[PDB]
């Protein structure tokens, strides 16, 4: 059940999120820093 | 009734491009010595720029099932969908593979695609998956069909990188359909008969003068000229010529009388052509148009034509015989016959005359594989070492 899941995930790279899509994705490390900055920012964290 | 692609058949892998509103046709190419990476050769601009199919021709060596291939890794048949194929480059003799080392260009997971000497390992093998809904896993392989190839080693589709400024073949999970077109069939070929893409010498007269360019005095402008010469040039590399058909598909078919083609000087890499001054001059690949570079073989000196033939998909009739047959070259558009100037080693010039002399017959002699390979290596090496010298001079 693991090999099939990995094969499907790599077949559809959109499942990895914008950071890991591979189309100019910044990367996991930059993505989580961006998410932290969003966390401090009230406008993007909440619906407002 | 309908042909099926089988092993030991020489094929060219073709892909289509729709860049900038325009439908372009491309083929997979890779030089043997030097760069092992693979580039794309344009085939849609065949009229304006001649394609170089010698490095694009591939041979289908074995087709094995996935389980049989796995057992082999643990340790003349027709292609069937769902099998593993071993692609061998015709010129180099090496095998197509995934390199697993990438340029890291715009794709996180990409693996570059190149040529590999060793057949061991699963990197060389590729699995053929039919893409069309009509085609089902286990169907007979169609002559005209679109295939998606999956790497055995990396499970990455062979695709064209559309986003990159320069189009590149790469192995990734994004899929692109590839169309295979037969170039020739080795078994059905007849010995002693001219075929497309065969390196040969043009011999004239009993003195056996060979149509060649001047020697290695390093002057490109006068190397561009052509003349009849005899002596050791017949066993020298300058007398080597290759015949490329104007058609792409089934380009290895038996050449017939009145069939237009192109002549390329293997050592120089340039193509024979006729200028407006009614003089022969080798021209560059970029400016080598179909009109100027068109030449044909006609059985008899008589000017009356037999009309036109209908092009057939297959080897065809063995209508041209090596040595025994006597041929006369005529430019397709102008209709003129190139003849020796005769105004006087011998160094007799080649001129374009619609009357010509009585003895304008040209015999055909087949070059050896080793000599053809050596001439191609010489051209590909002199090009690189001229680029290096120019860079150092700058």
UniProtKB/Swiss-Prot annotation, chain B:
Detected in heart muscle (at protein level). Heart muscle, brain (cerebellum and hippocampus) and placenta. Channel activity is modulated by phosphorylation. Phosphorylation is increased in failing heart, leading to calcium leaks and increased cytoplasmic Ca(2+) levels. Signal peptide: none annotated. Induction: By TGFB1. Cytosolic calcium-activated calcium channel that mediates the release of Ca(2+) from the sarcoplasmic reticulum into the cytosol and thereby plays a key role in triggering cardiac muscle contraction. Aberrant channel activation can lead to cardiac arrhythmia. In cardiac myocytes, calcium release is triggered by increased Ca(2+) cytosolic levels due to activation of the L-type calcium channel CACNA1C. The calcium channel activity is modulated by formation of heterotetramers with RYR3. Required for cellular calcium ion homeostasis. Required for embryonic heart development. Homotetramer. Can also form heterotetramers with RYR1 and RYR3. Interacts with FKBP1A and FKBP1B; these interactions may stabilize the channel in its closed state and prevent Ca(2+) leaks. Interacts with CALM and S100A1; these interactions regulate channel activity. Identified in a complex composed of RYR2, FKBP1B, PKA catalytic subunit, PRKAR2A, AKAP6, and the protein phosphatases PP2A and PP1. Interacts directly with FKBP1B, PKA, PP1 and PP2A. Interacts with SELENON. In cardiac muscles, identified in a complex, composed of FSD2, CMYA5 and RYR2. This is Ryanodine receptor 2. It comes from Homo sapiens. The lineage of its organism: Eukaryota, Metazoa, Chordata, Craniata, Vertebrata. The gene is RYR2.
């Amino acid at each position: 059940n693991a090999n099939v899941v990995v094969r499907l995930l790599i077949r559809r790279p959109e499942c990895f999120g914008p950071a890991l899509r591979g189309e100019g994705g910044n990367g996991l490390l930059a993505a989580m820093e961006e998410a932290i900055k969003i966390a401090e920012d009230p406008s993007r964290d909440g619906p407002s | 009734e309908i042909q099926f692609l089988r092993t030991d058949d020489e094929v060219v892998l073709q892909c289509t491009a729709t860049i900038h509103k325009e439908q372009q046709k491309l083929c997979l190419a890779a030089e043997g010595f030097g760069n092992r990476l693979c580039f794309l050769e344009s085939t849609s601009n065949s009229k304006n720029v001649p394609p170089d199919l010698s490095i694009c021709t591939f041979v289908l060596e074995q087709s094995l099932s996935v389980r049989a291939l796995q057992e082999m890794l643990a340790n003349h048949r027709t292609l069937l969908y769902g099998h593993a194929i071993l692609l061998r480059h015709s010129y180099s003799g090496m095998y197509l593979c995934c390199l697993s080392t990438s340029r890291s260009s715009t794709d996180k997971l990409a693996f570059d695609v190149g040529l590999q000497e060793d057949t061991t390992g699963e990197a060389c093998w590729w699995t053929i998956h039919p893409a069309s809904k009509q085609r089902s896993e286990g169907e007979k392989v169609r002559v005209g069909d679109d295939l998606i190839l999956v790497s055995v080693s990396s499970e990455r589709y062979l695709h064209l990188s559309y986003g990159n400024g320069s189009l590149h073949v790469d192995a990734a999970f994004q899929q692109t359909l590839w169309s295979v077109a037969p170039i020739s069939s080795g078994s059905e070929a007849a010995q002693g008969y001219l075929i497309g893409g065969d390196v040969l010498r043009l011999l004239h007269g009993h003195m056996d003068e060979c149509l060649t360019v001047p020697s290695g005095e390093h002057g490109e402008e006068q190397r561009r000229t052509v003349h009849y010469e005899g002596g050791a040039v017949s066993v020298h590399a300058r007398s080597l010529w290759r015949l490329e058909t104007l058609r792409v598909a089934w380009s290895g078919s038996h050449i017939r009388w009145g069939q237009p083609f192109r002549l390329r000087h293997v050592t120089t890499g340039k193509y024979l052509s006729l200028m407006e001054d009614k003089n022969l001059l080798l021209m560059d690949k970029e400016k080598a148009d179909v009109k100027s570079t068109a030449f044909t073989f006609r059985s008899s000196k008589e000017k009356l034509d037999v009309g036109v033939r209908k092009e057939v998909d297959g080897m065809g009739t063995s209508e041209i015989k090596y040595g025994d047959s006597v041929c006369y070259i005529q430019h397709v558009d102008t209709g003129l016959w190139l003849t020796y100037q005769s105004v006087d080693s011998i160094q007799r010039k080649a001129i374009m005359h619609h009357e010509g002399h009585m003895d304008d017959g040209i015999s055909l002699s087949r070059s050896q594989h080793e000599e053809s390979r050596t001439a191609r290596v010489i051209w590909s090496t002199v090009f690189l070492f001229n680029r290096f010298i120019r860079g150092l001079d700058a």
